[PDB]
């Protein structure tokens, strides 16, 4: 029957933010907002009490 011919896939050259790829982008967004999260809680804990 009728089939599809594509080029056989390759090593697929990296982007700019390819170094971020071992962790999903949903992890990196949680890392950034947990960073401000623990920094505000450090500030709340150290200023008051």
């Amino acid at each position: 029957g009728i089939s599809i011919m594509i080029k056989k896939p390759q090593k697929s050259k990296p982007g700019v933010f390819s170094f971020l790829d071992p962790l999903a982008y949903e992890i990196w967004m949680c890392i950034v907002f947990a960073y401000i999260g623990v920094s505000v809680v450090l500030f709340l804990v150290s200023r008051f009490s």
Partner: protein
């Protein structure tokens, strides 16, 4: 399941528990003001308030990046109230401002006390709004 939006609701239960503690301390400060005092409740209030904005200002940029448009929209009426008290009416001040040099003459003393129960009523409803949509995004 745990997701980034579910973490944006977990991270705002923790900081709205600070926002209610700013306001319990804010209703006691004006009640103890009427009993006695100006220069100390100038200084004790003035240090408190800028954390209360930017923690809520954190929530605006946190639910914007989480794509939570109802939750970002419900923080809008408290946000644009906050821009007015710092860009156009933080009356002259110039130490930080707003609960500063302008105390008695007693007309702002009634305006602050109506605000101080209006902050607590919004924050206690925000706490259960955040606790509901935490359980919503986790279970679903």
């Amino acid at each position: 399941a745990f997701t980034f939006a579910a973490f944006c609701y977990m991270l705002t239960l923790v900081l709205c528990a600070s926002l209610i503690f700013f306001v319990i301390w804010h209703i006691i400060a004006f009640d103890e003001l009427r009993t006695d005092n100006i220069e100390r409740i100038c200084c004790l209030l003035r240090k408190l308030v800028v954390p209360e904005y930017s923690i809520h200002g954190l929530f605006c940029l946190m639910f914007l990046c989480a794509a939570e448009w109802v939750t970002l929209g419900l923080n809008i009426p408290l946000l644009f109230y906050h821009l007015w008290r710092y860009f156009h009416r933080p009356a002259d001040g110039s130490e930080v401002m707003y609960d500063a040099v302008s105390i008695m003459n007693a007309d702002i003393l009634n305006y602050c006390q109506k605000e101080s129960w209006c902050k607590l009523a919004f924050y206690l409803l925000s706490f259960f709004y955040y606790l509901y949509s935490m359980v919503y995004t986790l279970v679903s």
